[PDB]
Amino acid sequence: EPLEPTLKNIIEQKSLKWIFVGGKGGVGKTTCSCSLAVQLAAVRESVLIISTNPAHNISDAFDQKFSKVPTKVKGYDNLFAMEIDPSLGVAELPDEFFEEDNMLSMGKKMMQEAMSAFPGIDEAMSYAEVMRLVKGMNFSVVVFDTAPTGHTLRLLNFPTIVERGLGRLMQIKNQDQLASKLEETLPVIRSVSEQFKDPEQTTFICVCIAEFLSLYETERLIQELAKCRIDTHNIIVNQLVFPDNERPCKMCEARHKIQSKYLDQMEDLYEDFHIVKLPLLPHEVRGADKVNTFSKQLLEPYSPP
Amino acid sequence: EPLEPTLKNIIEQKSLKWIFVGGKGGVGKTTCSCSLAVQLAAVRESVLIISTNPAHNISDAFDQKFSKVPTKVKGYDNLFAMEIDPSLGVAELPDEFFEEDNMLSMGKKMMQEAMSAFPGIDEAMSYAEVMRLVKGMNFSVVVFDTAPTGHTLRLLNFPTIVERGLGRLMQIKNQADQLASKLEETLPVIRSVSEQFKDPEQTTFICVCIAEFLSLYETERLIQELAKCRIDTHNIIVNQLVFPDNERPCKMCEARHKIQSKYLDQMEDLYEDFHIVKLPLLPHEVRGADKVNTFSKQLLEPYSPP
Amino acid sequence: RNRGGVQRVEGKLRASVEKGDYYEAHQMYRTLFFRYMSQSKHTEARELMYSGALLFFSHGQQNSAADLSMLVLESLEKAEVEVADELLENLAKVFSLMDPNSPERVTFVSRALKWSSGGSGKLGHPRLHQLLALTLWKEQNYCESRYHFLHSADGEGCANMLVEYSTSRGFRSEVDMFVAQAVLQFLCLKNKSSASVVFTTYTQKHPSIEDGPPFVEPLLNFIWFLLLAVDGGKLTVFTVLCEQYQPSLRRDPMYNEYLDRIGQLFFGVPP
Amino acid sequence: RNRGGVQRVEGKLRASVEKGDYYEAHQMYRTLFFRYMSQSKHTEARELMYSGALLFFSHGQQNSAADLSMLVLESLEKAEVEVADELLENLAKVFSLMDPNSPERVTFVSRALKWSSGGSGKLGHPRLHQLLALTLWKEQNYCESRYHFLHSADGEGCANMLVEYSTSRGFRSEVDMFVAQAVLQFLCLKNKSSASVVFTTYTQKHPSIEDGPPFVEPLLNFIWFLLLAVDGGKLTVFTVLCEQYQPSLRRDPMYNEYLDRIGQLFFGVPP
Amino acid sequence: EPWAAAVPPEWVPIIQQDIQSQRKVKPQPPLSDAYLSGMPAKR
Amino acid sequence: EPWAAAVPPEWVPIIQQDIQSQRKVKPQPPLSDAYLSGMPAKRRKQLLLSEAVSRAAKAAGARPLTSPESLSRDLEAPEVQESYRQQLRSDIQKRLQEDP
Amino acid sequence: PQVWQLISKVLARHFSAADASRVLEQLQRDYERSLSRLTLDDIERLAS
Numbered sequence A: 001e002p003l004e005p006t007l008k009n010i011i012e013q014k015s016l017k018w019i020f021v022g023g024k025g026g027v028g029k030t031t032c033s034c035s036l037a038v039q040l041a042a043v044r045e046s047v048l049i050i051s052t053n054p055a056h057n058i059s060d061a062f063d064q065k066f067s068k069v070p071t072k073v074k075g076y077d078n079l080f081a082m083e084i085d086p087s088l089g090v091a092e093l094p095d096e097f098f099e100e101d102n103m104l105s106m107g108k109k110m111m112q113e114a115m116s117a118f119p120g121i122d123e124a125m126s127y128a129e130v131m132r133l134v135k136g137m138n139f140s141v142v143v144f145d146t147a148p149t150g151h152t153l154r155l156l157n158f159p160t161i162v163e164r165g166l167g168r169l170m171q172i173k174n175q176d177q178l179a180s181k182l183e184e185t186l187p188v189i190r191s192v193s194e195q196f197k198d199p200e201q202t203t204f205i206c207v208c209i210a211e212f213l214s215l216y217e218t219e220r221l222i223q224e225l226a227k228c229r230i231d232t233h234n235i236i237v238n239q240l241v242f243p244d245n246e247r248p249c250k251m252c253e254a255r256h257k258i259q260s261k262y263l264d265q266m267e268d269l270y271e272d273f274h275i276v277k278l279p280l281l282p283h284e285v286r287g288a289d290k291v292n293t294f295s296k297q298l299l300e301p302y303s304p305p
Numbered sequence B: 001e002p003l004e005p006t007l008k009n010i011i012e013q014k015s016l017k018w019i020f021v022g023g024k025g026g027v028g029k030t031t032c033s034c035s036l037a038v039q040l041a042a043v044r045e046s047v048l049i050i051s052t053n054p055a056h057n058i059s060d061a062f063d064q065k066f067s068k069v070p071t072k073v074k075g076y077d078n079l080f081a082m083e084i085d086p087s088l089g090v091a092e093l094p095d096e097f098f099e100e101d102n103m104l105s106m107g108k109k110m111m112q113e114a115m116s117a118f119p120g121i122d123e124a125m126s127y128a129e130v131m132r133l134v135k136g137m138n139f140s141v142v143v144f145d146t147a148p149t150g151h152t153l154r155l156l157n158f159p160t161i162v163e164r165g166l167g168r169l170m171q172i173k174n175q176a177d178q179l180a181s182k183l184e185e186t187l188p189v190i191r192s193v194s195e196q197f198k199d200p201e202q203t204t205f206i207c208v209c210i211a212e213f214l215s216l217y218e219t220e221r222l223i224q225e226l227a228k229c230r231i232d233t234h235n236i237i238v239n240q241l242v243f244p245d246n247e248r249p250c251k252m253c254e255a256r257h258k259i260q261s262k263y264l265d266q267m268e269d270l271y272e273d274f275h276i277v278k279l280p281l282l283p284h285e286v287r288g289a290d291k292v293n294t295f296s297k298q299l300l301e302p303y304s305p306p
Numbered sequence C, D: 001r002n003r004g005g006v007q008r009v010e011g012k013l014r015a016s017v018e019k020g021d022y023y024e025a026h027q028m029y030r031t032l033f034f035r036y037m038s039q040s041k042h043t044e045a046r047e048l049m050y051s052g053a054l055l056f057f058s059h060g061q062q063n064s065a066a067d068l069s070m071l072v073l074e075s076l077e078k079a080e081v082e083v084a085d086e087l088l089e090n091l092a093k094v095f096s097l098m099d100p101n102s103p104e105r106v107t108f109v110s111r112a113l114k115w116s117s118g119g120s121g122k123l124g125h126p127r128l129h130q131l132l133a134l135t136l137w138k139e140q141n142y143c144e145s146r147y148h149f150l151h152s153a154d155g156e157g158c159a160n161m162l163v164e165y166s167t168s169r170g171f172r173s174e175v176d177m178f179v180a181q182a183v184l185q186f187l188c189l190k191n192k193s194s195a196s197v198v199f200t201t202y203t204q205k206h207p208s209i210e211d212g213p214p215f216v217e218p219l220l221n222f223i224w225f226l227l228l229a230v231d232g233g234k235l236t237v238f239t240v241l242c243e244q245y246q247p248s249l250r251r252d253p254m255y256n257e258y259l260d261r262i263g264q265l266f267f268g269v270p271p
Numbered sequence E: 001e002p003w004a005a006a007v008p009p010e011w012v013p014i015i016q017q018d019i020q021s022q023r024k025v026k027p028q029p030p031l032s033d034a035y036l037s038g039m040p041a042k043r
Numbered sequence F: 001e002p003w004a005a006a007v008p009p010e011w012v013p014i015i016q017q018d019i020q021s022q023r024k025v026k027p028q029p030p031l032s033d034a035y036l037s038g039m040p041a042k043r044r045k046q047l048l049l050s051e052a053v054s055r056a057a058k059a060a061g062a063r064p065l066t067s068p069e070s071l072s073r074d075l076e077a078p079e080v081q082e083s084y085r086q087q088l089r090s091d092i093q094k095r096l097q098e099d100p
Numbered sequence G: 001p002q003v004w005q006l007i008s009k010v011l012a013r014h015f016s017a018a019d020a021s022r023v024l025e026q027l028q029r030d031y032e033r034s035l036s037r038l039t040l041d042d043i044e045r046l047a048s
């Protein structure tokens, strides 16, 4: 009667291009997103994973360091990973063998120096790389890792605000050469914006644990996404504990009852949402083989012994 | 022989004014920060908590919703809490007896509206509140439930870059005077905050982490970044530890204890000259004044498994 | 089944409220409100938020009650409910229950006024302004009470509050100026009837002011003649009155500016 | 107050490397680097990072090795180590080991050049430029190799690489023009001796270039005369040569502005 | 008087007394802050 | 000779021969991509019939009486029209021998 | 005939005679310049 507690819909919906994973910190966004990307790679032609989260962990999750440029993930023929650069791409040859456009380039260099550590620079470069990918159209689907809920919301909000600002700037401009740069970038910007607003093109995966803070922070996140009109109809409950009735200790029992309370709360609260439940594995979840094994149950529904 | 695994150093360092808490998301920054603030409130005359994280949870931690202006915490007299504003001063009551400056009004309105969701505006307004409190001085010490490592480091470095930009502007004075006067007036407070953040006796950073690969090395990276910013930090909070009972240890507890032992030994080897205070995983939700107080009690008393 | 979740949520909210888990109850209220607004059950969501806000205010849960009141405003706005006197009364009641120093009231008021017939402008609806002014006056927030009264249309209550405010704070030499200022400000806006009624009431009721339209104080006589002229709208009379009473108008420079607006608003002075 | 934790960490790093847990080993390498730099054991930290980078390269752990090389550069920068041929050759080897397309090569090269004789100038120490040029030439990346040679002080290898590059990619009517551009670009920079040697070697050794400076190509004869003239700095002779050979110079328009700098670099022409 | 014609006759008398009062009225003392609270941003 | 005086005498004959030759020689053909990689990369040196004809009309100032959609429909990439690109491929194939 | 008819046949249908001739001659000059613009790399681009 209820929706299937599996992400099978995500795998099936081939029209899906952009997938975002978010929630409270430490719920497992990184591991869950890696698992989802691994599952997708088995179906789509090419899959990318992007860690917008500063101090990126996808390298840790896959136990294989990744550069800013996408690189192939060991053990997979079409899975690629990349860690966004919070800094600007200021690398370049030291200078030409003659004078240059220094009169113009110097202001740009000062701007880069100033904005290198600007608080919003991380998400700004994330949006820049999103635009670059939209231009490239290289990977069939791209998954995202976003650390907090608030900054994920800011990133999702960018397209709208940037498009509005660009439109207003055009109106003020037509009220010299750089105008080209506007018309060059307005289409692509718009192109991504609609994609973020189109449920077919994009979707958002909320991942949470069975606890008060996690549950209600997830609720706030869902409401904010509704405000931004970003589709989302599946949630990953992570780090569940199912007591081994053969040998249930005190802490396991208490944690299980707490998780049961909040999981029943979720079930009542989130009708018409797929609710995929993931147990807390004993061994660490790191490395391609472990991540693949953990992801297998992300599609096949889990059940306690 | 090693450093005492308790935050007693933080409590006794009465000169301490600003306390930051950070680390990998979900390790317990909010709960540990609340516990530390509760402990301090029993010593300092008045302490404050600020939820820098956009998704504020100190309300959830204390089971008592807090406004955007400091408010006393239920069950305490001198403990205040607040949540940073995610928006600018858009709500106001304008006058209408005369024509208004349409150009200036529209410019300010559009600026604030566009900047309302602009990234870092959370950090920008957090810095604004930092300056407001520095002028206010009303509170003895203020703790921050900082956002995850990245944005926290961005915020911490913000004073340096803003001070440098103001210095550049002073170097390029007018080469609209009310704007110049305002810019000149705010320099001393920016300088004061920048200096304070750099003083070990004035401020310190508490790193909180769990016994796992990702959390451990995220904490390591954060520590190195703080060293780059020269922000003092000499104590870590290992959180959510598990100590299986000798009687009936179950499979999951056994494996998790093995993993945590490995990574905790790693931490002990890696972080000499740090007070590594260890907190267990309680069997009940840590929410509400009583639960938080009980949890904080052991945050100062060196915990030892039965 | 597919909808039993909402009912179970509501029952759990009731149980938590009985238990006193006020913060958890507030969270449950927010969730229920969002779900209802999803189903376009706007009226039910608004009623639930109103009841919850009143309940939290009764228990002193100031912040939670304020948040639920804000949600009430969200329901009214998103549902585009036409202004109704009962809704204004409810909003004023909620605003009364809030803490005067808590900034949320401002945040609330600015929102509420905006919702109330937003087409008119920042004036909102005069009825709501009158209610807010009455509430503030009962709370002795004389500055804001006077502000709202001026934006209101209730001349009589405005005059009574001004009389109390003058007898409380103003100096002996300022008694007329208050009403004059108020009257002048009332004419900075197009509310001449309010000016007439408030001036009449202030003159009659105020003990320190002697009765009789031919007032002893030159300033009161000037204001009375200015009201009569505005009734006649004769620019020449207005200029004559302005020139003759210049020493009195100089008692406060702001008066001059008001006159200018008045001249524009009632005597065709060029912009 | 240390208790031998660093030694235990080092042992664990060794064990992890022996186990084939490369990523964890790289993490421990970073940790050890920072710990050592705290103790100011700059030389030991640099040696450890260099060895680890070589090890990771040997096993194909590209990104980890590149990160460790970046750490080597960080150690050199912080320790303010005077440039020495051994360190430069180590950096050259490390760069050679990196993957050509990865931007990390660009970043590492830029940082190394900035460090290399950082106080001398923005060009960087010629030895590093020459080593990078050789490495790129072996890679057949003629563009960057030529760029570095131009910035380098070596002409002989530059001349040979130019000969090979022109033969492989240059057209029939461009053999002389390649060396012309190289010589003019060298001369715009103060390194005139490099221009002389590269011209001599390229002309002597290029199969399609006849021996004896009196060449068939008028442009090459012009370059010869220009090299002779710059030795004396006679502006009138320079102008004579420029005007007379204008048809040859126009083959590449940029040549014109190049000559301009020559005039002010060696003939004292005002800018 | 030139202005007397504009105003209706019954307004005329009081005005002179008012004028006469304005010719003997002492300077206005400083205004109470309560009065000051009644103006916009500019006071 | 005017400029002969400034230069050393030994250069003058060679300069004379170069001057004579510079007129007999034709201009330099377009630069190769190889050499084109040398100069600073700021200033650098048509199978699509629809694009080519549109560009030519815009440059010459010509305007089709019918909307361009009709013209595009007429040349809707048939084999006979793609004989255009086959002829271009053949032309470049013949010109390749000039400098492989 | 050759490419010139291939272009003129479609041009004359909707262009004016003078406009068609101008477009054709501009196309011919562009073709000549492109042949001048040719390089060893152009072989790969035109082959596709």
Ligand SMILES: Nc1ncnc2c1ncn2[C@@H]1O[C@H](COP(=O)(O)OP(=O)(O)OP(=O)(O)O)[C@@H](O)[C@H]1O
Residues within 6 Å of the ligand: A024, A025, A026, A027, A028, A029, A030, A031, A032, A053, A057, A146, A147, A148, A238, A239, A278, A279, A280, A281, A282, A283, A284, A285, B024, B025, B026, B148, B212, B213, B214, B215
């Ligand atoms: N099902 C699971 N079983 C066991 N450990 C898990 C599971 N899911 C996640 N973990 C571990 O829990 C820790 C937190 O998870 P993870 O780092 O993926 O979270 P996150 O959403 O990326 O957090 P952050 O907000 O810090 O980016 C990591 O050690 C991860 O390996």
Ligand SMILES: Nc1ncnc2c1ncn2[C@@H]1O[C@H](COP(=O)(O)OP(=O)(O)OP(=O)(O)O)[C@@H](O)[C@H]1O
Residues within 6 Å of the ligand: A024, A025, A026, A211, A212, A213, A214, B024, B025, B026, B027, B028, B029, B030, B031, B032, B053, B057, B147, B148, B239, B240, B279, B280, B281, B282, B283, B284, B285, B286
């Ligand atoms: N010692 C503990 N014992 C039991 N539960 C704990 C403990 N510490 C934290 N928790 C719970 O773990 C979850 C995560 O902790 P918490 O929310 O305080 O972390 P955080 O660092 O503030 O999170 P985030 O970075 O996502 O804002 C919460 O349910 C918290 O109640």
Ligand SMILES: [Mg+2]
Residues within 6 Å of the ligand: A029, A030, A053, A057, A145, A147
């Ligand atoms: Mg993560």
Ligand SMILES: [Mg+2]
Residues within 6 Å of the ligand: A025, B026, B028, B029, B030, B053, B057, B145
């Ligand atoms: Mg937190």
Ligand SMILES: [Zn+2]
Residues within 6 Å of the ligand: A248, A249, A250, A251, A252, B249, B250, B251, B252, B253
């Ligand atoms: Zn257990």
